[PDB]
Amino acid sequence: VSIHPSYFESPHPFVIWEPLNEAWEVYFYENLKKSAKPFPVKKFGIARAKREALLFLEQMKLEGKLEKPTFSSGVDGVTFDQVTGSWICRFVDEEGRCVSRGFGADFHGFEEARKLAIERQAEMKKVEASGLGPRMRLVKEK
Amino acid sequence: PFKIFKASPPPAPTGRKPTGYRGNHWHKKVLYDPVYPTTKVPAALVPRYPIDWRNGGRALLIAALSKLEGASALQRRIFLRENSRESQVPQTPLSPFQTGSSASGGGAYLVSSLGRKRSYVGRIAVSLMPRHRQIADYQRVGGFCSPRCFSECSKELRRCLCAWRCTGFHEHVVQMDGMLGEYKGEVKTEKPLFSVLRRQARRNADPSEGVAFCAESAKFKSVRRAQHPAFEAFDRQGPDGPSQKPAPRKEPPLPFYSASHVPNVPRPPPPQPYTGPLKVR
Amino acid sequence: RAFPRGCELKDPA
Amino acid sequence: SELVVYERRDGKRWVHRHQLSLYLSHAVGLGYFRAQFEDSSVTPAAVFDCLSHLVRERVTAQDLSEFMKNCVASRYRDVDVLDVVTDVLSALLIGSADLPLLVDIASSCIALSLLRPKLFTAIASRLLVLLPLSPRQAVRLVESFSQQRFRHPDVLPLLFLSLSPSLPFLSPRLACRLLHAVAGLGACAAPAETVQLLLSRVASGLALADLTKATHALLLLEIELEQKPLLESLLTAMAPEIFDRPVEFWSSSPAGPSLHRRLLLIRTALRHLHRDTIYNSLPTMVRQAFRRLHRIEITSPPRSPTHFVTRMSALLTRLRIAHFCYAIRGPLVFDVLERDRPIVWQCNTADRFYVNSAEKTTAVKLQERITQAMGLKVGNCEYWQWMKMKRKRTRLEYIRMQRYYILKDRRQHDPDFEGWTLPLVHHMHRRNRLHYDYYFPNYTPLSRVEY
Amino acid sequence: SLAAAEQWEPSPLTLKQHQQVVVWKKDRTCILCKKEVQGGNVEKVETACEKAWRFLSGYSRSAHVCPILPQMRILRYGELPLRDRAKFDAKLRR
Amino acid sequence: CGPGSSRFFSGTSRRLSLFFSDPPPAYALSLHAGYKIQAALCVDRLPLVYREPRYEKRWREFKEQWEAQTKNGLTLADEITFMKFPFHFFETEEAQKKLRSLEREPERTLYLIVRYGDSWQFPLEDRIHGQSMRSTLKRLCSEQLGSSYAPFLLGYSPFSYAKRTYPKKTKEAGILGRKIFYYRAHHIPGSENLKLPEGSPVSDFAWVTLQELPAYISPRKLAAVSAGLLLEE
Amino acid sequence: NVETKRRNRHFKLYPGENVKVSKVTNLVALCHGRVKFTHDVSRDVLVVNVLPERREELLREDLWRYRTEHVRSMEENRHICFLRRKAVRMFGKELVNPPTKPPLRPFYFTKYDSWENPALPDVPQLDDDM
RNA sequence: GUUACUAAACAGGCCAGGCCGACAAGAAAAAAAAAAAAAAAAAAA
RNA sequence: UUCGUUGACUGUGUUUACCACGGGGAAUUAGAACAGAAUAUCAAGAAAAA
RNA sequence: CUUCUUGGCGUAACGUUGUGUAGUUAAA
Ligand code: FES
Ligand code: FES
């Protein structure tokens, strides 16, 4: 067919033209995850596929599904990592290094993993603030 | 003589397990296909000739030559090849220790060996050449200077001098000659490979234009004729547009009738990947 | 909100 | 075998000299110390005295601080011994240190280029008690924290409050140093007015080192566009000095290579980020000075490779991905560079993040900006992710999916919140594989695969 | 530069760092030698096993000369971590 | 750096054709994005004498001595040491008891440099449209250096490339500049030296070491070539 | 002579997400979910995936998640499976009309049991998230 | 959402029912190179 | 590497793809749990000033 | 910081049941 090149320009960052499938993909967030719905030209036609993609974008905007989910714990140095799906806690090891530990949400439970991370960070913070190195003992004389 | 009507050697008989006679085990799929696994041929069933002086004594002679030259030369050649294939761009100097402060590594071979936890014993085992292909390759490029002299030294009688006393600046000369003399184009094989493929140079986009001087205007002008701009674009960039008619027939129309519209196979095979050189950014 | 339980919370402890 | 730390009524702390020597000997190794001292008869009891002599009944924080000063003076930069000594000093610092001593220890840590978060945590805890600091000492402490990447929530506001009354009256050089430290710490580590005040002081005001520090601070703060007049003035002031100084100053002088690296970094940033905006509009003198600097090859000190980068390289090799490790592009070093595609793999370690934070440092961010402006795509593997994965199969799956995410030319949405299901980290069936072992369609290497 | 590298005089500290060392991958017993080993243990190459030293130095064409040769990991002393260096200092002093 | 016509030459044709093309050549040139293509040859002569590092000699001698003491060395039996071939030479000690010269500076590496007027550079030639760089190099050797001079070429690929943009007046003629691709070569030992063919654009030639190269060639050309030049300090 | 044949039998399909390969090369599921198909343009083969989901009503507005789609690489196949998937195990979702009765009886007892018998009591569903 | 099963005729023809305690199971590791030349050893780990 | 090894295990749990039935047996799931024994593979190794 | 592998191979997969051999009963 004959089509102007401006057809493939999208007016919103969440609306993308996918040329392999020749479809308009609309991104959104559902159930604390990212999803994309395609609108194919083979289904709707040239102009109608884009029109329906824009209408679905407006629907998701009204539903509030364009907002980025956020995971926070309120404790500095403890944050959720998507790549490993784990709660990461950062502290200082015995060697005086900066080290981290990751507790798996799939295994422990999301909140269980968060709690384990926070408690481990607190324990290591206590040990570090103590100040004693390896194989060290504190004695007070008066 | 040198020129001769050479016969095509008969293919070597690949063995087979005496099973699965009713099935086609020679599909053209690539190892290791999840749904088209390839049948293995045990090494104990591959037909091999009995060992005589032609296949055993020659190996013994080449092994004695390698012993005289020293396994250290073979180890050094292998190490130099492996480091060269991976250090084709300027690296930062690397020490083998966190606190040496003075010792230098000697190549990215260090990084690769540390990452793979490669076997110190394994390198010696490889250099000792326990395999037929290894001995055959030493008989062909066994010379220490091979990156620069190739197989020219394969029969030289004072070749061990390179192994004994080719060091330092001479090793640098060997490497610098080899880098310029090595192949840099596409390798074309149907055999399986599993190692990092050797580099293929990228190719520049534009071609060169021929220009000749014209005194009528005292300027240089293109040798090629003008032609229409559309014809120039077709000649340069390609067919233009997303669809065009097939190439016109270049042979005289056949007197007989043939069903030339019929495709070669009912179900065409999948498209072949482009193995040629990539463009330059 | 409630969360689904992990593999650990499903073993016969 | 073990060390004992004693505490007095008045809060002082100390250890026995003999016990300290035995502890150091057993912690490092008497063979190592014998080799270092060039004597096979050195007993464990004399190790501390021998070290003191090399760098020249109770040992204290002042004694260990003096040891650090002597180590800096004699260019003794052994990391194991310094780590043990710093552990002991961190133990001793509690309740027995004065402000000049804290400043001296911080400066020694800066000079030795050691990251000791435990020692600086102890220093911060002691400091909060001491102050309910001269401007020089405050600036030195701020520089120490910036070098340590320790964005401490408590002490930093205290130091900035102490410095607040003196900001209008700081000398240009002190202002440049403080601005560089603030840029290293991030613009959010100090009040809003601080950067404007420091820049105004610098503008009112200075050697080539101070000028390059100020320019690097601008680049780190990402205000080079908003501070064009100041950046142009800085470059104009520098260029005559760069021309005046001799050629060998950039290669032989102790302060030559680092200044050369910083100037080349400034050149690369201006070239690749603001070519049309700034670089091509610069004075011919500035451009000629930059060309003169660029003509000279840069020297880099030997470094050991990180096992993180080493394992990443090994996994790429297994995946048949051609790459180069520790490649050089101008003043930048790439942990891993791909041969057949324009992608740089960055194996970020803890030192590239602020202490106990998920945020990369300003230097890392600037390097990433330059790498992206050059046309290369950066794939970051965080150290905590690497440690959690911990396994060859998990890391291979991560490498494949991350490479696809970086190199894809279609479905170009925000990289964050992309799905991940790695083996033995997410729940999955055992035989659920994305990377079948050794299987490549058409024997095509992953370096040639078209995503 | 190149001249200094050729003229280099290794310090005793550098030589100690370059000292070779055997790290044992796993626990195992020798069949013919009856030696007992524990994983993670560190020994000197010279005294760890003479039969294995044969292959490691180039006076053996058999990789099975030492029955537990594959359980060896040959590293230089300077590459070891501080913990292992301090732990096994006594047995690596030469 | 400065190849200007005044410093290059005046009143000649072949010499100026290469660098300015002011007298237009008689063949078809080849431009790549408006820059004329040129091939440059960098012939080198390897050191005539062999030097061995002390650590190598020490390790070898110590290994021989250690093997002798421990009785672990090679056997080398008489039945495989003495079998009467024309090249036989061994005999036991017991039985015995019963600036233009190739020979210059034999302990270093030399590079052939050519003087185009007052400028010292490497041999250079233009590429005629449609012919290989190997053919261009062969023409360079046969017409500029010596009709019988045929150094060994290390490969078909260049080891470096450089660019030079003409001034405004010169580029107004339709050629923006010249781009040069450098190729390494070995002077085969025992081969005759150069003999400049009659009419050749070369004025003189020399064989200089790396240390002397900057004393003759411009720093820009030295920067262009040093990456590919061998390492010798 | 497979390359010359035309019947659809000779050309096998390929496993994808949450799918295994059997001894005779059958493609079998590995998780509780809903089937999806994909077309691999590079290899010109069909790929079978299973999107993990707990049992619930299949709505008309959710049918687009199981369309057959074109991909170039298995990495893109995994990406598409993630994008169309309904929810993740660690967060779950609000089930829309999930089943509440016991499962169908074993085949050897009765081949024609009734789905979600209202006369049977509600029993917990604690197997379809695995 | 979704096009895939399916060879009846004494129709046009196929069949060897067998191998392996392991270079044939198999952890980890490794694994087959364009053209031309050398060698005439059926040779990737 | 010329590299180990014998899970080509002993048992508890009646749930599961296909379907006249039989041979869950053209050759289906980690019935992801539980009680024993065995084999191979760990991880970490961060920080090189002026 | 849960756990890097594993109860053959087999593009002809062994003859079901029975008999015989063999295994099990401080219980079934
Ligand atoms: S082996 Fe050929 S020249 Fe050395
Ligand atoms: S340990 Fe006994 S022979 Fe090697």
In this structure, what is the dihedral angle of CA atoms G4, G7, G11, G17, given to the nearest 10 degrees? Answer: 160
Return the sign of the alpha-carbon dihedral for residues F138, F140, F143, F147.
negative
Largest CA distance in chain A: 95
The runs of H, that is alpha helices, within D56-163 are 61-74, 79-92, 99-112, 117-130, 135-148, 155-163
Q: How far is residue D50's CA from residue D57's CA, in Å, rounded to a whole number?
A: 15
Q: Which of B21, D211, G89 is nearest to A106 (CA)?
A: G89
Tell me how far the alpha carbon of residue F111 is from its chain's centroid: 5
**Contact, D72 vs D27, CB < 8 A?**
no
Q: Which of D145, D74, D155, D138 is nearest to D116 (CA)?
A: D145
Helix (H) or strand (E) run with residue A56 in it = helix A46-63
Please identify, by atom number, the ligand 1 atom nearest to the C-alpha of residue B153. Answer: 2
Q: How far is residue D234's CA from residue D208's CA, in Å, rounded to a whole number?
A: 9
**Contact, B210 vs F130, CB < 8 A?**
yes
Relative to beta strand D58-59, strand D323-329 is unpaired
In this structure, what is the dihedral angle of CA atoms B119, B120, B125, B126, given to the nearest 10 degrees? Answer: 80
Lookup: nucleotide whose C1' is closest to D110 CA: I49
Residues 6+ apart with CB under 8 A from E6: B168, F53, F54, F55
Tell me which DSSP letter residue E77 carries.
G
User: Tokens for B217?
Assistant: 């205007």
**How far is CA B191 from each of CA D198, D442, D444, F10, G12, rounded to the nearest angstrom?**
67, 10, 12, 62, 24
CB contact under 8 A, A107 and C5: no
Tell me which DSSP letter residue F143 carries.
I
Please give the method by which this entry was determined. Answer: cryo-EM
**Contact, D102 vs D119, CB < 8 A?**
no
Residues 6+ apart with CB under 8 A from D205: D171, D172, D173, D175, D176
Lookup: nucleotide whose C1' is closest to E82 CA: I45
Return the CA Rg of chain E: 15
Task: Give the residue carrying structure tokens 């020399």.
Answer: F206
Angle at G107 between CA G103 and CA G111, to 5 degrees: 90
Q: How far is residue D415's CA from residue D380's CA, in Å, rounded to a whole number?
A: 12
Residue F96 CB neighbours (<10 A): 7
Q: How far is residue D29's CA from residue E92's CA, in Å, rounded to a whole number?
A: 10
- E37 CB under 6 A from ligand 2? no
User: Tokens for F86?
Assistant: 């024309």
User: Tokens for D380?
Assistant: 């970051």
User: Tokens for B131?
Assistant: 């395999």
Lookup: nucleotide whose C1' is closest to B129 CA: I2
Helix (H) or strand (E) run with residue F35 in it = strand F35-45
Helix (H) or strand (E) run with residue E12 in it = helix E12-18
The runs of H, that is alpha helices, within chain F are 5-8, 14-19, 54-70, 78-81, 93-97, 133-140, 168-171, 213-216, 219-226
Helix (H, G, I), strand (E, B) or coil at F8: helix
Burial of D169 (0-12, 13-18, 19+ CB in 10 A): exposed
Angle at F143 between CA F141 and CA F149, to 5 degrees: 40
Helix (H, G, I), strand (E, B) or coil at E29: strand
Crossing angle of helices D307-318 and B109-116, in 10° steps, is 80
- Half-sphere exposure in the Cβ direction for F199 (13 Å, CA): 5
CB contact under 8 A, B111 and D310: yes
Q: How far is residue D75's CA from residue D209's CA, in Å, rounded to a whole number?
A: 22
Residues facing D157 on adjacent strands: none
Q: How far is residue D428's CA from residue D434's CA, in Å, rounded to a whole number?
A: 12
Q: How far is residue D277's CA from residue D228's CA, in Å, rounded to a whole number?
A: 9
Residue D390 CB neighbours (<10 A): 12
Task: Give the residue carrying structure tokens 């062969």.
Answer: F138
Strand-by-strand arrangement of the D323-329 sheet: D323-329, D332-338, D343-348, D377-382
Residues 6+ apart with CB under 8 A from B30: B192, D439, D440, D441, D442, D443
User: Tokens for A64?
Assistant: 């509030």
Tell me which DSSP letter residue D164 carries.
G
Task: Give the residue carrying structure tokens 């030369």.
Answer: B73
User: Tokens for B67?
Assistant: 């012993």
User: Tokens for F153?
Assistant: 């070429």
**Contact, D149 vs D183, CB < 8 A?**
no
**Would residue A22 be called left, alpha or beta, if left means φ above 0 and alpha means ψ between -120 and 50 degrees?**
left
Q: How far is residue B116's CA from residue D313's CA, in Å, rounded to a whole number?
A: 9
The runs of H, that is alpha helices, within B143-249 are 146-149, 160-165, 169-181, 229-237
Residues 6+ apart with CB under 8 A from B69: B142, B144, B159, B160, B163, B164
Three-class DSSP labels, chain G: CHHHCCCHHHCCCEECCCEEECCCCCEEECCCEEEEEEEECCCCEEEEEEEECCCCCCCHHHHHHHCCEEECCHHHHHHHHHHHCCCCCCCCCCCCCCCCCCCCCCCCCCCCCCCCCCCCCCCCCCCCCC
**Contact, D59 vs D17, CB < 8 A?**
yes
Q: How far is residue B162's CA from residue F65's CA, in Å, rounded to a whole number?
A: 22
**Contact, B242 vs F58, CB < 8 A?**
no
Angle at G124 between CA G123 and CA G127, to 5 degrees: 125
Q: How far is residue B216's CA from residue F24's CA, in Å, rounded to a whole number?
A: 13
Crossing angle of helices D192-204 and D172-185, in 10° steps, is 150
Residues 6+ apart with CB under 8 A from B251: none
Burial of D29 (0-12, 13-18, 19+ CB in 10 A): buried
Q: How far is residue A69's CA from residue A32's CA, in Å, rounded to a whole number?
A: 6
- B146 CA from centroid of ligand 1 (Å): 6
CB contact under 8 A, F37 and B211: no
Chains C/F: 3 or more C-beta pairs closer than 8 A?
no
In this structure, what is the dihedral angle of CA atoms B50, B53, B55, B58, given to the nearest 10 degrees? Answer: 160
Q: Chain F: list its partners (3+ Cβ pairs within 8 Å).
A: B, E
Q: How far is residue E36's CA from residue E33's CA, in Å, rounded to a whole number?
A: 9
Chain I: nucleotides below 7 Å from protein CB are 1-4, 15-19, 21-22, 24, 26-30, 32-34, 40-50
**Contact, D178 vs D166, CB < 8 A?**
no
- Half-sphere exposure in the Cβ direction for D236 (13 Å, CA): 10
**How far is CA F146 from each of CA A87, F149, F187, F199, F205, rounded to the nearest angstrom?**
76, 5, 13, 11, 12
User: What does this entry list as its resolution, in Å?
Assistant: 2.2
Angle at D383 between CA D377 and CA D384, to 5 degrees: 125
**How far is CA B278 from each of CA A23, A133, B32, B201, D271, rounded to the nearest angstrom?**
29, 57, 27, 8, 27
Residue D225 CB neighbours (<10 A): 12
**Would residue A64 be called left, alpha or beta, if left means φ above 0 and alpha means ψ between -120 and 50 degrees?**
left
Nucleotide H44: closest residue by CA–C1': B133
- F53 closest CB neighbour out of E1, E6, E59: E6
Helix (H, G, I), strand (E, B) or coil at D346: strand
Helix (H) or strand (E) run with residue D392 in it = helix D392-407
Q: How far is residue B80's CA from residue B70's CA, in Å, rounded to a whole number?
A: 16
Q: Which of D340, D417, D336 is nearest to D381 (CA)?
A: D336
**Contact, E14 vs E31, CB < 8 A?**
no
G47 φ/ψ angles, rounded to the nearest 5 degrees: -120, 135
Largest CA distance in chain D: 78
**Contact, G71 vs G43, CB < 8 A?**
no
Please, after which residues is chain B broken with C–N above 2.5 Å? none
Strand-by-strand arrangement of the A34-40 sheet: A15-18, A23-29, A34-40
Q: How far is residue G77's CA from residue D217's CA, in Å, rounded to a whole number?
A: 45
DSSP string of D36-64, one letter each residue: HHT-TT--GGGHHHHHHHHH--EE-HHHH
Question: With b meaning 16 or more CB within 10 Å and e meaning fewer, what string describes F47-83?
Answer: beeeeeeeeeeeeeeeeeeeeeeeeeeeeeeeeeeee
The runs of H, that is alpha helices, within F71-194 are 78-81, 93-97, 133-140, 168-171
C-beta pairs of F221-229 under 8 Å, 24+ apart in sequence: F221/F1, F221/F121, F221/F122, F221/F162, F223/D295, F224/F160, F224/F162, F224/F182, F225/F42, F225/F122, F225/F160, F225/F182, F227/F159, F227/F160, F228/F42, F228/F159, F228/F160, F228/F182, F228/F184, F229/F42, F229/F44, F229/F111
Return the sign of the alpha-carbon dihedral for residues F59, F60, F63, F68.
negative
D87 at E interface, C-beta within 8 A = no
**Contact, D118 vs A128, CB < 8 A?**
yes
The runs of H, that is alpha helices, within chain B are 58-69, 71-86, 109-116, 120-127, 132-141, 146-149, 160-165, 169-181, 229-237
Return the sign of the alpha-carbon dihedral for residues A102, A108, A113, A118.
negative
Q: How far is residue B124's CA from residue B118's CA, in Å, rounded to a whole number?
A: 11
Taking CB atoms and an 8 Å cutoff, what residues of chain B touch G6?
266-267
CB contact under 8 A, D388 and A84: yes
Assess whether D26 (CB) lies less than 7 A from strand H. no
In this structure, what is the dihedral angle of CA atoms B36, B41, B43, B46, given to the nearest 10 degrees? Answer: -150
G63 at B interface, C-beta within 8 A = no
Say which amino acid occupies D112.
Answer: L
Return the CA Rg of chain B: 28
Angle at D344 between CA D341 and CA D349, to 5 degrees: 155
For ligand 1, which residues put their CB under 6 angstroms from it?
B 143-145, 149, 153, 159, 162, 166
CB contact under 8 A, C3 and A107: no
Angle at F95 between CA F94 and CA F96, to 5 degrees: 90
**How far is CA B34 from each of CA D442, F77, G11, rounded to the nearest angstrom?**
14, 57, 13
Q: How far is residue D84's CA from residue D90's CA, in Å, rounded to a whole number?
A: 10
Tell me which DSSP letter residue F100 carries.
-
Please identify, by atom number, the ligand 2 atom nearest to the C-alpha of residue E52. Answer: 4
Tell me which DSSP letter residue E2 carries.
H
Is the peptide bond between B32 and the residue preceding it cis, with omega within 30 degrees of 0? yes
Q: How many CB pairs under 8 A join B and D?
A: 115
**Would residue B265 be called left, alpha or beta, if left means φ above 0 and alpha means ψ between -120 and 50 degrees?**
beta
